[PDB]
Design a protein around this ligand. Structure first.
Ligand SMILES: [Zn+2]
Ligand SMILES: [Zn+2]
Ligand SMILES: [Zn+2]
Ligand SMILES: [Zn+2]
Lengths: 126, 12
C-alpha cells in the first residue's frame, strides 16, 4: 500500500471534474476513444486520463491511492510551496509527489539521469 | 527524471 503523509490525510479533496483537462473526453473516451478512468486533482478537481498524463499503468495504480495534485497544483512535499521555477520541482517516479531540488536531503543541483524517487518511496534499510 | 516543466511539455 502507498504511505500517506499526515498533512495529506484529512486535507479537503476538491470536487473532481469528470472530463480530462487534456483531451476533454469523459471516462468513456480517451484519445483512442476507449474507456479509461480519470485521475483527479485533490486541490482543483482537474482530471486527466492516465494515458493523457503519460503515466504507466504501475504509476497510475500508485497515484490513485494517494492525495494527488495536478501538474499546475503540485506543491513541494517538504516545504509546501510552489516556488517560481518549474524546472526545479522534481516529480517522483514512484508516487508523483513534487520536491524542490533544494528541498531534497541532501539538496540536488543537477538533474538525475534516470528515474528519481523521493525519500518516502525509498524503503528502509536493514 | 521529470520536473513540473518537463511534465508540462510532455503532456501539453
Ligand atoms: Zn484525456
Ligand atoms: Zn489541480
Ligand atoms: Zn520545497
Ligand atoms: Zn515518491
Amino acid at each position: 500500500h502507498m504511505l500517506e503523509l499526515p498533512h495529506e490525510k484529512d486535507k479537503p479533496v476538491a470536487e473532481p471534474i469528470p472530463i480530462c483537462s487534456f483531451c476533454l473526453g469523459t471516462k468513456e473516451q480517451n484519445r483512442e476513444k476507449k474507456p479509461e478512468e480519470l485521475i483527479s486533482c485533490a486541490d482543483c478537481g482537474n482530471s486527466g486520463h492516465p494515458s493523457c498524463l503519460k503515466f504507466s499503468p504501475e504509476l497510475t495504480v500508485r497515484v490513485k491511492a494517494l492525495r494527488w495534485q495536478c501538474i499546475e497544483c503540485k506543491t513541494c512535499s517538504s516545504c509546501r510551496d510552489q516556488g517560481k521555477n518549474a524546472d526545479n520541482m522534481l516529480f517522483c517516479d514512484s508516487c508523483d509527489r513534487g520536491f524542490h531540488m533544494e528541498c531534497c536531503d541532501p539538496p540536488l543541483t543537477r538533474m538525475p539521469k534516470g528515474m528519481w524517487i523521493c525519500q518516502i518511496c525509498r524503503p528502509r534499510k536493514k | 527524471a521529470r520536473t513540473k516543466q518537463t511534465a508540462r511539455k510532455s503532456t501539453g
